[PDB]
Amino acid sequence: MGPGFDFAQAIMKKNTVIARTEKGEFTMLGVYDRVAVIPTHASVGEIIYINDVETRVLDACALRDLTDTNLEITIVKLDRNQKFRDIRHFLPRCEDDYNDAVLSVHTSKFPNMYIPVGQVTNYGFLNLGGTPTHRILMYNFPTRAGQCGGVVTTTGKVIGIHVGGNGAQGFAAMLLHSYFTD
Numbered sequence: 137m138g139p140g141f142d143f144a145q146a147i148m149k150k151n152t153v154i155a156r157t158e159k160g161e162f163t164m165l166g167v168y169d170r171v172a173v174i175p176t177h178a179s180v181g182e183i184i185y186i187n188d189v190e191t192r193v194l195d196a197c198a199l200r201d202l203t204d205t206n207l208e209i210t211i212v213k214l215d216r217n218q219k220f221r222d223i224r225h226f227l228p229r230c231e232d233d234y235n236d237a238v239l240s241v242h243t244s245k246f247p248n249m250y251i252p253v254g255q256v257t258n259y260g261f262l263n264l265g266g267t268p269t270h271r272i273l274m275y276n277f278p279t280r281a282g283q284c285g286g287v288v289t290t291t292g293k294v295i296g297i298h299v300g301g302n303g304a305q306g307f308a309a310m311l312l313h314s315y316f317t318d
């Protein structure tokens with residue numbers, strides 16, 4: 137309906153797939169080549185399903201910062217026969233706050249779902265299901281089950297992936313350009 141949903145849609149239509157692990161279905165964001173991200177609580181193994189295709193996991197890394205604290209991002213390299221459109225130029229380089237964010241989800245249940253979550257705060261520390269976690273973004277939408285992996289964008293930037301909620305707020309792990317240098 138506006139430039140926010142326009143950018144969100146462009147990212148969803150080319151750079152997402154439906155990942156399925158032993159812990160169910162997830163919005164998975166493809167970043168470049170065969171490299172994608174998913175919440176660490178997805179518990180990626182040796183094998184994953186991508187758009188309902190048995191796919192070997194060539195590598196999987198659950199990111200932590202240099203304080204040895206969880207970031208709740210798992211970077212996955214997929215044994216896929218096709219490369220993602222490279223979107224690393226849409227990743228912010230620094231931790232920051234944002235206005236007018238959209239949280240975008242695509243599953244079998246929730247296809248083509250776009251939520252205007254509004255103002256985003258650099259929240260920082262969060263105790264996420266008992267795990268100390270850093271670089272958390274917070275927004276004031278009562279998000280729900282099946283929205284995890286959801287992509288958070290602003291007009292111009294892909295800023296994080298949805299990793300949880302407390303019924304009043306939602307929380308995203310930051311995506312930083314430095315995570316995907318090669």
Ligand SMILES: NS(=O)(=O)c1ccc2ncsc2c1
Binds near residue numbers: 137138
């Ligand atoms: N993205 S936008 O805000 O410029 C916009 C608004 C209304 C509209 N109606 C049809 S196409 C279209 C685009």
